[PDB]
Design a protein around this ligand. Sequence first.
Ligand SMILES: O[C@@H]1[C@@H](O)[C@H](O[C@@H]2CO[C@H](O)[C@H](O)[C@H]2O)OC[C@H]1O
Ligand SMILES: *[C@@H]1O[C@H](CO)[C@@H](O)[C@H](O)[C@H]1NC(C)=O
Length: 319
Amino acid sequence: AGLNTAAKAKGLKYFGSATDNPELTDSAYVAQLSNTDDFGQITPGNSMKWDATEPSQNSFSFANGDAVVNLANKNGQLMRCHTLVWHSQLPNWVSSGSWTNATLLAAMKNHITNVVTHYKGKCYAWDVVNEALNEDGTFRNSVFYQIIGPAYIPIAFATAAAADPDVKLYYNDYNIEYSGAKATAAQNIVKMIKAYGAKIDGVGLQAHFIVGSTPSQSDLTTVLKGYTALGVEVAYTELDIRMQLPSTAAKLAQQSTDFQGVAAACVSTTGCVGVTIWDWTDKYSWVPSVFQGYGAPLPWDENYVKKPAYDGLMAGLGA
Ligand SMILES: O[C@@H]1[C@@H](O)[C@H](O[C@@H]2CO[C@H](O)[C@H](O)[C@H]2O)OC[C@H]1O
Ligand SMILES: *[C@@H]1O[C@H](CO)[C@@H](O)[C@H](O)[C@H]1NC(C)=O
């Protein structure tokens, strides 16, 4: 019947989509987001980030995050919860602070404990740390790395696990889906977390790809299995395949094969639990505001009509 029914028939836990709170007032949008043939899982694109949830220190705010959970609960959809520790979308008090290791650690741990406890029981997975790596596999020089050093990563995981021992704890990043220094360094993050004694359950592969320049099915699968070999699960967490505009029939067809290989890579790898696309309609994609000249990245167009990529995904899921 749809992406989620097809995914589950192949043993995946879900096919799902991100969304954001302004979109939930569009009734036609909501109807399709709520179609559980296509979506069995929801990620909040923004309302669980640090700026949204802890706008002042020790002053938490959950209305917007909770509204997305409420919609998923209404529909019987799973949640992925996104994201606890990240260098972007920090409130001013974090980025402007004069910190020591002890005072930033206390603020970081408090952030994690409060947000995870609030959502205890409500999330399939958390993206506990997001985008901790440079492209060469060194650590990104965020405020957390500058002040705390590499230990911020396992400390974040351990803190989340203490607050909610049941939820799957993920490391999430982009450009870790293809073979290379960054992917290898993501494997090393998994190893480091476990060497500290902290828990890590999954690797989240953002999968912000480019039409005609998407990793091949074979490389995607080698990379997925490089993580599942480590005793973790994997998921594609933010899948979109941006095209260099303008859109054409030929580009739409290439986009379909590109999406097909992603889905098929996941099915081929036991331990790949699911795919989430980063929203579902071109109308609401983040891409054009960030990648000048690119767009049309998703399986439905800006009029909410399926594109060839929808069929590519179904074919990769063996439906
Ligand atoms: O802010 C980051 C973006 O920088 C990140 O951009 C990458 C860059 O490397 C790639 O071309 C990949 O396709 C893009 O997504 O994307 C995630 C975002 O949070
Ligand atoms: C910060 O302190 C924790 C001990 O609580 C430690 O694991 C970490 O390595 C320290 N980092 C720095 C730069 O001192």
